[PDB]
């Protein structure tokens, strides 16, 4: 009649329950890789165990209610800790989370556990979530993207080259009718798409429904003129889900092909709802990642963009901005190639040289089209085609509306540059070595391209990278 393990009140180390280095991960576990910087005097095992505990089942002192359930079944487990080379106080802590911890189909819930409270613990100095292994059994609980790359190309009837888009400029301050005027002139010159700026929602200078109607006129005029399917990402981003849905409904009722949403500033709950609406009504959904660099820029703290991209894939989006590598916003090449594969492909093997900490199996969830946008122009075209291949949308806002001859010629310049690079690649030319030659030849041929070539010839964006592997 000896006593079994009972309730003992008081504080004990988290590592006694949550550091389990001999744990064999299950194929349904959600895995996290945390770059962890402990405070002085806090062992890495204890820090990793605290992160595991406080993102799963545990708090700061022993609770009696553990005994009513099975902590073995539910606890998050720090199962491995690696030193970070180059770093004397950074570790990669690996945490396994049983699939029962998560609400089916809810990115919101998954983030709330894994990143909800642990980043603020006094016992750590910095914490960065680098990667998540989303198992097939959890992937299958999500609707995911409304359409995905193959369906999108099939609906648009567009094959054999990158898609081309363009953000209308000035960001803010244009009227609805000037917005449509700019859109028509852009689309008619050869761009597949234009878009509302991420912060163009509904404002005193331009109310949303006015914009949607004039943009519809522009889409249909440019489509009739060119014979190519056109779209403009009309922004459904709003202050409330009711306003977001009213905007999506208006796009549906105008018969236009594509809307956009700012998934992080609007939020995952609203994004997932909008993605389901877009699936149910046949709208393409472009996702803008506004605010991501608040979270993902610094190497020591936050969440890497690859996790934000996985989360968007799950919540749902047909497009997601991927960065450009060569443009005005940061994105290192290898980092970017890694998360582009995580966005598009069905099965991505572990590859630490591209920041892929876990093998990821998407179990047939549609791929998300990467959108390369921001400070790019015609001379970047070879590099963009080389980096992304055909399954991407390349967007030129300033690179279209900054052309000296206006939007149609600006659009034509970009379309010619893209087609010339695509043709050259298909003919066997190496765009990484011959890209300048391809553009120079095309500039000599096309007057519209030549004007763009001259204006932006010396413009490059080359800075020290913060988000290094």
């Amino acid at each position: 009649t000896k006593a079994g393990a009972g309730f003992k009140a008081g504080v004990k180390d988290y590592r006694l329950t949550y550091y389990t280095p001999d744990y064999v991960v299950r194929d349904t576990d959600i895995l996290a890789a945390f770059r962890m910087t402990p405070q002085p005097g806090v062992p890495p095992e204890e820090c990793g165990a605290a992160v595991a505990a406080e993102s799963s089942t545990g708090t700061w002192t022993t609770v009696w209610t553990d005994g009513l359930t099975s902590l073995d079944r539910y606890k998050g487990r720090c199962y491995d800790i690696e030193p970070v080379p180059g770093e004397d106080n950074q570790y990669i802590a690996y945490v396994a989370y049983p699939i029962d911890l998560f609400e089916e189909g809810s990115v919101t819930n998954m983030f709330t556990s894994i990143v909800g409270n642990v980043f603020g613990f006094k016992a750590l100095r910095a914490l960065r979530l680098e990667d998540l292994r989303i198992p097939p059994a959890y992937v299958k609980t999500f609707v995911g993207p409304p359409h995905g790359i193959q369906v999108e190309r099939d609906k648009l009837n567009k094959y054999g080259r990158g898609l081309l888009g363009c953000t209308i400029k000035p960001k803010l301050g244009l009227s609805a009718k000037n917005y449509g005027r700019a859109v028509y002139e852009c689309l008619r010159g050869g761009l597949d798409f234009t878009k509302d700026d991420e912060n163009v929602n509904s404002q005193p200078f331009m109310r949303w429904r006015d914009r949607f109607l004039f943009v519809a006129e522009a889409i249909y005029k440019a489509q009739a003129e060119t014979g190519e399917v056109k779209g403009h990402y009309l922004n459904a981003t709003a202050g409330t889900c009711e306003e977001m849905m009213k905007r999506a409904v208006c796009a549906k009722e105008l018969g236009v092909p594509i809307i956009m949403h700012d998934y992080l500033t609007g939020g995952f709950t609203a994004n997932t709802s909008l993605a389901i609406y877009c699936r149910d009504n046949g709208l393409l959904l472009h996702i803008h990642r506004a605010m991501h660099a608040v979270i993902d820029r610094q190497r020591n703290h936050g969440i890497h963009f690859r996790v934000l991209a996985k989360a968007l894939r799950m919540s749902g989006g047909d497009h997601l901005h991927s960065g450009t590598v060569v443009g005005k916003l940061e994105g290192e090449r290898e980092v970017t190639l890694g998360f582009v594969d995580l966005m598009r492909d069905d099965y991505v093997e572990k590859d630490r040289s591209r920041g892929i900490y876990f093998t990821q199996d998407w179990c047939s969830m549609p791929g998300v089209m990467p959108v390369a946008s921001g400070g790019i122009h015609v001379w970047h075209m070879p590099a963009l085609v080389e980096i992304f291949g055909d399954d991407a949308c390349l967007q030129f806002g300033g690179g279209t509306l900054g052309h000296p001859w206006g939007n149609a010629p600006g659009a034509a310049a970009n379309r010619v540059a893209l087609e010339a690079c695509t043709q050259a690649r298909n003919e066997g030319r190496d765009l990484a070595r011959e890209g300048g030659d391809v553009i120079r030849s095309a500039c000599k041929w096309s007057p519209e391209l030549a004007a763009a070539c001259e204006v932006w010839k010396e413009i490059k964006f080359e800075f020290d990278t913060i988000d290094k592997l």
């Binding site: 014979g227 796009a251 055909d390």
Partner: protein
């Protein structure tokens, strides 16, 4: 400033903004199809069925989003499954255009792993 004409300037998707493809340039695209193991296929349409249009939406409620008529064209024979010879593709271009000399004709290629058309361009305009 040159003005981009809105008049009689309809386009046909990939490669429409370049000079018309020469026979050498078409053959190079066929070589790319065969090098990547994609499935060549020819499609064609009379002029009245070659351009995207909206007439079937008269029968719809509010469900026209990404519905257009005339995206589908007519298949020439069957996709050339197993074709690893560019000369066979070029011969079929000749046969198709001989049979339908007034039609729009496009060469496409399919990838069966992505299950999507992975290239396409016009090879004949009436």
């Amino acid at each position: 400033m040159m003005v981009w004409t809105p008049v009689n300037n309809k386009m046909f998707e990939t490669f429409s903004y370049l000079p018309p493809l020469t026979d050498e340039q078409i053959a190079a695209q066929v070589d790319y199809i065969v090098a990547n193991g994609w499935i060549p296929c020819l499609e064609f349409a009379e002029a009245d069925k070659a351009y995207v249009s909206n007439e079937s939406a008269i029968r719809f409620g509010s469900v026209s989003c990404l519905y257009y008529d005339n995206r589908y064209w007519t298949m020439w024979k069957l996709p050339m499954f197993g074709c690893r010879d560019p000369m066979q593709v070029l011969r079929e271009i000749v046969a198709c255009t001989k049979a339908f000399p007034d039609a729009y004709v496009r060469l496409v290629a399919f990838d069966n792993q992505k299950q999507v058309q992975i290239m396409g361009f016009l090879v004949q305009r009436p």
